[PDB]
Write a protein that binds this DNA or RNA. Structure first.
Lengths: 57, 58
DNA sequence: CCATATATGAC
DNA sequence: GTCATATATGG
């Protein structure tokens, strides 16, 4: 149990990464992670966050 | 650890329960569970499923 | 409890 | 990679 918290800064960085990869449907967890370059950030962190981002109305 | 499986029939039942209470925005986990009356079905099962249903685009 | 964020398991 | 479900958080 060491849960992660999507601070506005992190989220902002995530967004930029996703735009840079051509939006939420095109981007991939691995690709985003690669771009974000954040120490301790796992692919599973990004995989989950992206799923949610993608279904946000 | 006993992960559950939302068969189409179960889902169908879930939907009916939710409509019965006035669609996704009005319905509540406890309320749905009460209506569904399914052996082994916990409130946490329904809570999760409802969250997803509520954010389903279509 | 009701709602939401995040994690973990399953295709 | 995608998607389904569970578990943790906040009110």
């Amino acid at each position: 149990k060491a849960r992660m918290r999507w601070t506005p800064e992190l989220h902002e960085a995530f967004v930029e990464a996703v735009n840079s990869l051509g939006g939420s449907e095109r981007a991939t967890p691995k690709g985003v992670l690669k771009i974000m370059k954040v120490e301790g950030l796992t692919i599973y962190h990004v995989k989950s966050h992206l799923q949610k981002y993608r279904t946000a109305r």
